């Protein structure tokens, strides 16, 4: 299936995003540092075939790995600064985003 | 695996020249097989045999044969032995000098 | 290099006796590479391409 | 643990001993799935 | 001593450019590469005597060798081609009569014809038409061969039979049956002679090739009677010492006579009839084949012309030509001057489909359907006349209204092309790093994530240590732990011997005790929201 | 780790014993390398029996 740019991501804290609006893109202005998500992208994975003793744990606390991975863009090591600009291209025959 | 066909981002792919060299030799071998069950004229079959000797010979190495039979790339296809010798090859570069 | 005519020498290095050859060439834009070249024997010589 | 690296010409029965089958087709993969 | 002198000069000066090696003597490239390792260090501006001997012996481009092969080849004349064609036809007619020279060949013909009359095939698929609309004619004609045979059975007792087996052959010659039925009795006819000839290898080779039997004694004995024991079992009174050696195999090659009488029975008539039948067949057949071989020679000039335009779409030039030849020989079986034609116009149809049906088959590292290649070549051509026409460029939407396809069946094909990159491509930096030197792995377990999991089977071992023997074992039972495992809940109901329902109770009891915060907080560490 | 093999439709000559400098198949059979070359590329026969 296609990839999404949502904000609801596998294992991202509520303040761990802190800089993504509804579209999952950073606000113009928010100072960024090592590891902050500029754009929250997630790509699906179909039936990972997880390990045993992790099936055990996920059955113990009822949690279960979702369908989407964590291929989300992020600021590299060290390089820290401000987000001065954002462009949003889109395929012509496709739905556009709220931030778009 | 040692001659992979890795997927590149954006729909493209990347392979090693060993792949297409193997493919061409298999093509010439299939053709000579088809010729042999036809009992076609010995001229055509002898050209096929010559061509397969050419293909395998350029497979194991590129230098002794006259023209390194390149591809759509305007570079010579990089055969087996070239992945052992030379500066770039496994021995001189990657088997002692490694990250 | 521009198509024209050139008089090279290549001091030393030919015949390894100290002989200084003289190999004149005429590189045109479109055609043949006319090359007059000497030997050690001081007999002029000609090649086509 | 090994020692005394060796090398020699390879017999056709040797080479058959290595493989786990024989390639026949010049196809590689499926262009729709990548299997 | 010309090249011997130049190699002496190479050992003298130690570096020799194109001037000398061009002027001290393709073969040029070959000889320069050879002079490289006297060693001499040749350039462009046990080897010394080894290379000297190989440089003492006086092209292999298979295209040059192929032209030189074709040198003794020349365009054949038009009606001369008709003559070759009629020679081929005479060969096929020799083979036809040969099969009709075999009567039981026509017997199996009637067998197949009855099976299609018993409906074992199609009445128009039993043959590729007769040489003449409705099958009840051709079928009753086949039925004529049925009655035309049983009129022949009256006369092997020989003067009236020999010309009766042929009258159903002369009618036979005016037919055209499908090749599979054609080759079956043929490939059975090929089986027929191998069976009989192998017998004489048991018959004669076990006498003439072992028992010191001169050729005269078998030929003067066998051929002339050729069937009974008068030629074989009478040779053991030859007043010979080697005819005395005809005893140990006398019961064995007599078997080979037991197999020949089978074969005479199996042939229905004398094996020498069947011999010169299929002997005659392959006699003309090779000549017939010889006729075809002659014609294919004088048409490769077409095929080199045909393939002259398909070349640089990623296929070796000698690979185009060989696929070209495959059609050129396949058409020799099919081309018919019986209309009166030039084979030249006929060939390029087959030879065009040869190159193109192959070029879409074995010309990428990822293969694709010809009907998809049908598509890509339809877009790229229809892309031309729209890019050139409308102005800038055909957008896939614009292609959607030229070709009314859904544009997501189109756009997937535009993702189809562009075969993979050579992983030995040289990247920039002038560092000689190839492309493949940066393509990373995805199968690797992240070395930390292995380091994590080693505590997991330790940590779950921790809480599973402080469990009850039932719960500790049943959970290892229920989940895939420390074995080839994951026995289903009925399966744990059997081994623990409690109940398919009761196990889930203690299983529910298992982690409900482990669902205790402040009791199993270890795996609480293995949670990150 | 696995390897595949290929059954060639006909024999063919290894280049390393063919065209290497000392010609491992050259001096294994008393021949000049150009002779076995003419043999290999279907040019002129070589007699046996
Ligand atoms: C650093 C180097 C240029 C320096 C001169 C540039 C030139 C081409 C770049 C690679 C290729 O694009 C292929 C591939 C595309 C993937 O999508 C992302 C990874 C890959 C490996 C790229 C990483 C890197 O950016 C490369 C090596
Ligand atoms: C050496 C050359 C730079 C010029 C100096 C290298 C640097 C990275 C290479 C490109 C990347 O792989 C991405 C992309 C993948 C496609 O599949 C084929 C096209 C592209 C554009 C590649 C072709 C070429 O090889 C590139 C430009």
Swiss-Prot record, chain A:
Domain of life of the organism encoding this protein: Bacteria
Subunit structure, as described in the record: The RNAP catalytic core consists of 2 alpha, 1 beta, 1 beta' and 1 omega subunit. When a sigma factor is associated with the core the holoenzyme is formed, which can initiate transcription.
Please give the family membership noted in the entry: Belongs to the RNA polymerase beta chain family.
Q: What does this protein do?
A: DNA-dependent RNA polymerase catalyzes the transcription of DNA into RNA using the four ribonucleoside triphosphates as substrates.
The entry's protein name is DNA-directed RNA polymerase subunit beta
| Species the sequence originates in | Escherichia coli O157:H7
Span within the full-length protein is 846 to 945 of 1342
From Swiss-Prot, chain C:
The source's domain of life comes to: Bacteria
Kindly state the subunit structure of this protein.
The RNAP catalytic core consists of 2 alpha, 1 beta, 1 beta' and 1 omega subunit. When a sigma factor is associated with the core the holoenzyme is formed, which can initiate transcription.
Q: To which protein family does this belong?
A: Belongs to the RNA polymerase beta chain family.
What function does the entry list?
A: DNA-dependent RNA polymerase catalyzes the transcription of DNA into RNA using the four ribonucleoside triphosphates as substrates.
**What is the protein's name according to its record?**
DNA-directed RNA polymerase subunit beta
Origin organism of this chain? Escherichia coli O157:H7
Curated annotation (Swiss-Prot), chain F:
What does this protein's UniProt record list under function? Answer: DNA-dependent RNA polymerase (RNAP) catalyzes the transcription of DNA into RNA using the four ribonucleoside triphosphates as substrates.
Reproduce the UniProt comment on modification after translation.
Answer: Acetylated on several lysine residues in the presence of glucose.
State the taxonomy lineage. Bacteria, Pseudomonadati, Pseudomonadota, Gammaproteobacteria, Enterobacterales
Q: How does it assemble?
A: The RNAP catalytic core consists of 2 alpha, 1 beta, 1 beta' and 1 omega subunit. When a sigma factor is associated with the core the holoenzyme is formed, which can initiate transcription. The rRNA transcription and antitermination complex (rrnTAC) consists of RNAP, NusA, NusB, NusE (rpsJ), NusG, SubB, ribosomal protein S4, DNA and precursor rRNA; S4 is more flexible than other subunits.
Q: What family does the entry list? A: Belongs to the RNA polymerase beta' chain family.
Q: How is it used?
A: Co-administration of salinamide and rifampicin or salinamide and myxopyronin suppresses the emergence of resistance to both antibiotics.
Source domain of life is Bacteria
Q: What is this protein called?
A: DNA-directed RNA polymerase subunit beta'
């Amino acid at each position: 299936g296609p990839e999404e740019i949502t904000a609801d991501i596998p294992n991202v804290g509520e303040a761990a995003l802190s800089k993504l609006d509804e579209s999952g893109i950073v606000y113009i202005g928010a100072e960024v540092t090592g590891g902050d998500i500029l754009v929250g992208k997630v790509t699906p994975k179909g039936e990972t075939q997880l390990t045993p003793e992790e099936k055990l744990l996920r059955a113990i606390f009822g949690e279960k790995a979702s369908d989407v991975k964590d291929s989300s863009l992020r600021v590299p090591n060290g390089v820290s600064g401000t987000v001065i600009d954002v462009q949003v291209f889109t395929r012509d025959g496709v739905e556009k985003d709220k931030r778009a | 695996d040692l001659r992979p066909l890795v997927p590149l981002d954006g729909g493209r792919f990347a392979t090693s020249d060993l792949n297409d060299l193997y493919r061409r030799v298999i093509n010439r071998n299939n053709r000579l097989k088809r010729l042999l069950d036809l009992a076609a004229p010995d001229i055509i079959v002898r050209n096929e045999k010559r061509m397969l000797q050419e293909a395998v010979d350029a497979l194991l190495d590129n230098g002794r044969r006259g023209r390194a039979i390149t591809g759509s790339n305007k570079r010579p296809l990089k055969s087996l032995a070239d992945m052992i010798k030379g500066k770039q090859g496994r021995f001189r570069q990657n088997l002692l000098g490694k990250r | 290099r521009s198509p024209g005519v050139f008089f090279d020498s290549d001091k030393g290095k030919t015949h390894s006796s100290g002989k200084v050859l003289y190999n004149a060439r005429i590189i045109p834009y479109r055609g043949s590479w006319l090359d007059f070249e000497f030997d050690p024997k001081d007999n002029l010589f000609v090649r086509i391409d | 643990e090994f020692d005394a690296i060796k090398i020699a010409l390879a017999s056709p029965d040797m080479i058959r001993s290595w493989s786990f089958g024989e390639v026949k087709k010049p196809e590689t993969i499926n262009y729709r799935t990548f299997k | 001593s010309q090249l011997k002198l130049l190699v002496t000069r190479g050992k003298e000066q130690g570096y020799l450019t194109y001037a000398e090696v061009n002027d001290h003597l393709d073969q040029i490239e070959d000889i320069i590469q050879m002079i490289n390792d006297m060693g001499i260090q040749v350039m462009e501006e046990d080897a010394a005597e080894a290379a000297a001997q190989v440089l003492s012996s006086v092209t292999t481009d298979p295209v040059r060798m192929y032209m030189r092969e074709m040198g003794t080849v020349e365009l054949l004349t038009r009606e001369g081609e008709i003559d070759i064609a009629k020679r081929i036809e005479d060969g096929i007619n020799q083979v036809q009569c040969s099969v009709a020279e075999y009567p039981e060949a026509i017997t199996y013909l009637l067998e197949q014809y009855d099976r299609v009359e018993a409906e074992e095939a199609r009445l128009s698929d039993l043959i590729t038409g007769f040489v003449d609309i409705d099958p009840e004619l051709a079928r009753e004609k086949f039925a004529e061969l049925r009655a035309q045979y049983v009129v022949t059975r009256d006369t092997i007792k020989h003067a009236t039979a020999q010309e009766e087996i042929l009258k159903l052959s002369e009618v036979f010659k005016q037919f055209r049956l499908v090749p599979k039925q054609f080759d079956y009795l043929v490939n059975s006819m090929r089986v027929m002679m191998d069976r009989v000839r192998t017998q004489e290898r048991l018959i004669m080779k076990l006498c003439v090739e072992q028992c010191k039997m001169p050729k005269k004694n078998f030929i003067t004995l066998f051929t002339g009677n050729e069937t009974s024991d008068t030629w074989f079992n009478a040779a053991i009174a030859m007043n010979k010492p080697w005819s005395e050696k005809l005893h140990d195999v006398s019961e064995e090659v007599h078997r080979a006579l037991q197999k020949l009488q089978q074969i005479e029975e199996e042939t229905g008539l004398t094996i020498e009839q069947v011999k010169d039948i299929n002997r005659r067949m392959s006699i003309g057949e090779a000549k017939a084949r010889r006729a075809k071989k002659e014609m294919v020679e004088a048409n490769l000039r077409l095929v080199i012309s045909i393939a002259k335009k398909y070349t640089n779409r990623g296929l070796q030039f000698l690979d185009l030509i060989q696929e070209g030849n495959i059609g050129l020989m396949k058409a020799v079986d099919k081309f018919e001057y019986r209309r009166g034609y030039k084979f030249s116009t006929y060939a390029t149809w087959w030879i065009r489909q040869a190159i193109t049906r192959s070029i879409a088959d074995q010309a990428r590292t990822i293969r694709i359907p010809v009907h998809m290649i049908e598509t890509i070549n339809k877009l790229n051509r229809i892309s031309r006349q729209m890019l050139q026409e409308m102005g800038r460029e055909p957008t896939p939407e614009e292609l959607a209204e030229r070709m009314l396809m859904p544009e997501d069946k189109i756009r997937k094909v535009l993702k189809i092309a562009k075969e993979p990159i050579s992983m030995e491509t040289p990247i920039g930096d002038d560092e000689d790093s190839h492309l493949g030197d940066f393509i990373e792995d995805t199968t690797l377990e992240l070395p930390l994530d292995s380091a994590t999991t080693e505590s997991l089977r330790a940590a779950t071992h921790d809480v599973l240590a402080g469990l009850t023997a039932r719960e500790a074992k049943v959970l290892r039972m229920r989940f895939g732990i420390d074995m080839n495992t994951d026995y289903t809940l009925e399966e744990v109901g059997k081994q623990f011997d409690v109940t398919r329902e009761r196990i889930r109770q203690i299983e529910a009891k298992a982690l409900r005790k482990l669902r205790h915060p402040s009791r199993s907080e270890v795996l609480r560490s293995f949670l990150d929201d | 780790e696995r390897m595949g093999h290929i059954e060639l439709a006909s024999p063919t000559a290894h280049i390393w014993f063919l065209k290497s400098l000392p010609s491992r198949i050259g001096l294994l059979l008393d021949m000049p390398l150009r002779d076995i070359e003419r043999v290999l590329y279907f040019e002129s026969y070589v007699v046996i029996e």
